[PDB]
């Protein structure tokens, strides 16, 4: 997260870190046994880390649970990033508490102008590299479809939205991928892609979760 703030320990209780020896992506806990992330975060050997603040220090609220199954969206296209969503099932159910909690799926899609909370352990610099140990947060509005498409001609599908600031300076970045965009207490986005980070006229692009609620629910119901 570039241009954000330190969230505070365990203040984003649905935020998970995906670990394969190291943090490599975010995700969102949606019930005691399932996480939503980005398909472009797929790999084998995932351990889901819940209850994290400092990802390099055991602070006492963590739960580390291996993935038993990963399910990339049936229509994910890694070239266009259309349908950039995956589900991860945990080998055991997380113990839910005030610091480890699920985030509701959206009943309805969100509109441009709605404020959201974007979070992660990604790079905090737009030029160069600095990775935080503690969770970072950014408040950002959803941008209109027309301004998203104008920023990225020929690239924005109906399964994507932009959020952030056209002036630059505030954005998600490398290592935030797969993490949450939460608006009015609902998971509306997944950190997906953008050109660089925090550049003028290049806001972040996010997977539009409301399009996937039916698939999420039916996948959970049979897996
Ligand atoms: Ca920790």
From Swiss-Prot:
Its cofactor is Ca(2+). One of its GO terms (cellular component) is extracellular space. Synthesized in the acinar cells of the pancreas. InterPro entries: Peptidase_S1_PA, Peptidase_S1_PA_chymotrypsin, Peptidase_S1A, Serine_Proteases_S1, Trypsin_dom, TRYPSIN_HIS, TRYPSIN_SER. This is Serine protease 1. Residues 1-221 form the Peptidase S1 domain. Its EC number is 3.4.21.4. It comes from the Eukaryota. Binds 1 Ca(2+) ion per subunit. The active site is at 40 (charge relay system), 84 (charge relay system), 177 (charge relay system). Disulfide bonds join 7-137, 25-41, 109-210, 116-183, 148-162, 173-197. Interacts with SERPINA1. One of its GO terms (molecular function) is metal ion binding. Subsequent cleavage after Lys-125 leads to alpha-trypsin. Further cleavage after Lys-170 yields pseudotrypsin. A cleavage may also occur after Arg-99. Not sulfated on tyrosine residue(s). One of its GO terms (biological process) is proteolysis. It comes from Bos taurus. It catalyses: Preferential cleavage: Arg-|-Xaa, Lys-|-Xaa. Ca(2+) binds at residues 52, 54, 57, 62. Keywords: Calcium, Digestion, Disulfide bond, Hydrolase, Metal-binding, Protease, Secreted, Serine protease, Signal, Zymogen. It is found in: Secreted, Extracellular space. Substrate binds at residues 171-172, 174-175, 177. It is an enzyme of class 3 (hydrolase). Is inhibited by scorpion cyclotide trypsin inhibitor TopI1. Its main location: secreted. Belongs to the peptidase S1 family. Pfam families: Trypsin (PF00089).
């Amino acid at each position: 997260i570039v241009g954000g703030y330190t969230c505070g320990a365990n203040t984003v209780p649905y935020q998970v870190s995906l670990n394969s020896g190291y943090h490599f992506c975010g995700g969102s806990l949606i019930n005691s046994q399932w996480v939503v992330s980005a398909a472009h975060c797929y790999k084998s050997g995932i351990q889901v880390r819940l209850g994290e603040d400092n990802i390099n220090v055991v602070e006492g609220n963590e739960q580390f649970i291996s993935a038993s199954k990963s399910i990339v969206h049936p229509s994910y296209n890694s070239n266009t990033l259309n349908n950039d969503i995956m589900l991860i099932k945990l080998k055991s159910a997380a113990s839910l508490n005030s610091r480890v909690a699920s985030i509701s799926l959206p009943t309805s899609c969100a509109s441009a102008g709605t404020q959201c909370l974007i979070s992660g352990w990604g790079n905090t610099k737009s030029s160069g590299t600095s990775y935080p140990d503690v969770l970072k947060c950014l408040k950002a509005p959803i941008l209109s479809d027309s301004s998203c498409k104008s920023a990225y001609p020929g690239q924005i599908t109906s399964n994507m939205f932009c959020a952030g600031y056209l002036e630059g300076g505030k954005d998600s970045c490398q290592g935030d991928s797969g993490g949450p965009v939460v608006c009015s207490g609902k998971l509306q986005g997944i950190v997906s892609w953008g050109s660089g980070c925090a550049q003028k006229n290049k806001p972040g692009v996010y997977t539009k979760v409301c399009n996937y609620v039916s698939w999420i629910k039916q996948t959970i119901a049979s897996n």
